[PDB]
Amino acid sequence: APFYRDTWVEVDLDAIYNNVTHIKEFIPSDVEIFAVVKGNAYGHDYVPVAKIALEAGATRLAVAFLDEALVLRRAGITAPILVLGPSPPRDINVAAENDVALTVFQKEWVDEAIKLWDGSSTMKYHINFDSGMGRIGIRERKELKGFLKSLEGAPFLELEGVYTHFATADEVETSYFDKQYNTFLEQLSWLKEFGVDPKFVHTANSAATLRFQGITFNAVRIGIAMYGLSPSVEIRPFLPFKLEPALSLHTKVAHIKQVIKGDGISYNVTYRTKTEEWIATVAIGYADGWLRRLQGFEVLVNGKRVPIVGRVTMDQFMIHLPCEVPLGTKVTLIGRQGDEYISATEVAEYSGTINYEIITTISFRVPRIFIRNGKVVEVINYLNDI
Amino acid sequence: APFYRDTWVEVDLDAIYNNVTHIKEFIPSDVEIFAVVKGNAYGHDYVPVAKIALEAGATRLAVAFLDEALVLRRAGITAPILVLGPSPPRDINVAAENDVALTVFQKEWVDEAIKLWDGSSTMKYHINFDSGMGRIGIRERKELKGFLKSLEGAPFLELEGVYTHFATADEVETSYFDKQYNTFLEQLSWLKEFGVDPKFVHTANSAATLRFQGITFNAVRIGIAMYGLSPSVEIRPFLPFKLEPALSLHTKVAHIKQVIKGDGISYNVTYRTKTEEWIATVAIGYADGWLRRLQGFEVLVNGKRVPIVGRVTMDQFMIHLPCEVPLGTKVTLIGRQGDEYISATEVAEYSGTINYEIITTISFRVPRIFIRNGKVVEVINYLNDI
Ligand SMILES: [Cl-]
Ligand SMILES: [Cl-]
């Protein structure tokens, strides 16, 4: 699969397999893993991550919205897939015909689904209880009650599981998390009172799964830890085993030159050289997700930290090197060169954000190259496929 | 073309056609326009923008790197296409077989292209002179001479044009711009001295074209103004005619609930309600390019500006509304509701960035809907092509 600019993501499928294996070893043997692939598998690519995670013993998959799930099904994947985000009622039949379960938690959604149902297809759903995330899900007892009442008109909807999600499992202090846990217990009690067997319960994300007792239920939902990154800096010290980061981001010196003292670099001349400087250019920019707020950040060239100088542009940025290098010299934005390592977390901290957002926003413009047992096994260039 | 989440980009093809028509009428009638589509046509989608710009009288297209050019060629577009960014020598024969011109400005690129030539292909190229952008291009007299000498060994490489790019055309005060113009003049003189006809010269981006006499040459390269946005706030007062913004971004209320006083919303409970509050949730988040730094930004609901509350998550965010609205209510992130308008510029200013970066980073996840003469003519859902 070809690509024609020397800028690429490298995804180490061994690393993803090892994180999933380690998690599966760490949790009880009767507890399933959803591999959570939403956001183009956190920027690692939907399909290869899904397949490797399954190979490593994840049994189920989860994605943000229905189109993401169809990407998986069109790739030949047959494992269960749950849509975690809210879905409009018009998705009922297409979810059904593609064996995809949806999160459903509103009597109004059920009303509309009854109207839109094509009569040929039953759909599986999970109930989301909002136990303090404030995002989606049922919160109140009366609310749950009317939701169940309306479900009686929809025998084509079939409960497959019930879940909640934690807002603070990545904070050392547990007050809010403990309140969520207690609230969720009350919600499950309501459900049993209304005569509904939850069947299959899941609550824990990466942070909760790696920290807390009695949190596993029937399944956990793993995103960031599968990609080998800590949910936060503050809990890193407390994780039970070493996470192996799966993603790196590289570029090659596309031009190099010596720029006289005082000359300007990039838009609005926000950087001037202070001596005769070696300035390299690389072919990646904010259209690839490498945003302007990274100006001044230090990338790796020949194992040395070297700064991005001048404004980052849509497709290119410049770097001040101490020495001439040849055109083609590898430049690493996330990953390892020699003894040096730039984590997605370090890029995120410089950017004033979190690692999730750094990885997931690496744009579809950038090819992914997949490594397994140390050999390249696949290249995906999403531009090729338009 | 189907999509299964109610979040979308609207691209008004009329606005684009109109901006290009107006630019074409504003510049001299023998001056061509490159339609600049790099970055997924600044978030608007490569192919339909290219097509409508050409229908509108643009005669040529420009992209950042080869793969973007091949998207256009595969869509059956036959107009000239220039790659503006730096390309590896290994690109030589593919760019030839695909009728794509590359930017070429390095002796070493030539030496390498010599090695790599199909012995059959002829490739067209433009010389980039760096007159002060500091990014790529020839800067020196001896450099140019050496470059032209190496070309002697490459009869398969054919000059199509010569260009430079301005770093400061979007600043009121013109000192740096005037120095670039003078440097570029000297550079063209060296080129004439060394026996080369430029053939076809271009220098101006949107801001230069809209401001300056004597700057058109044989063609201008239009990006941001084609999409109907000002290159900066500083020069907006001074543009010769009104720009018509082509892109808006919308979603729907996917959940709505009343949350009691003091309850928390989203990760790390960074927002708690100050009274009993109506909180809506929408299915777009940072994986769509709607980044966490937009927390606190006000979007439009029912013609009213309302705040994003709590952390934006990968696929969803929450909004504090003054009144209950029905599920499915329209939420506009960029665009018009009633008398209210949120420009990409306003989003950028809140974000501490520029409008270019806001539009161009709307993810491949989000479907684009295209409007011509007020009717939908096309939907592109990139996730489908996977
Ligand atoms: Cl949730
Ligand atoms: Cl340039």
Residue numbers in the entry:
A (entry chain A), B (entry chain B): 4 to 389
Pull text from the paper.
Here we report the biochemical and structural characterization of B. anthracis (Ames) alanine racemase (AlrBax), an essential enzyme in prokaryotes and a target for antimicrobial drug development.
Residues in the N-terminus (16–245) fold into an eight-stranded α/β barrel, while the C-terminal residues (246–389) and the first 15 N-terminal amino acids are part of a predominantly β-structure. The oxygen atoms from the acetate molecule in our model are within hydrogen bonding distance to the side chain oxygen from Tyr289', the main chain nitrogen from Met317' and, perhaps more importantly, to the side chain nitrogen atom from the catalytic Lys41 residue. One striking difference in the active site involves Asn131, which in other alanine racemases is generally a carbamylated lysine that participates in a hydrogen bond with the residue homologous to Arg138. In AlrBax, however, we note a prominent chloride ion that is located near Arg138 in the active site. As AlrBax lacks the conserved lysine residue necessary for carbamylation it has apparently drafted a chloride ion to fill the same role for this species.
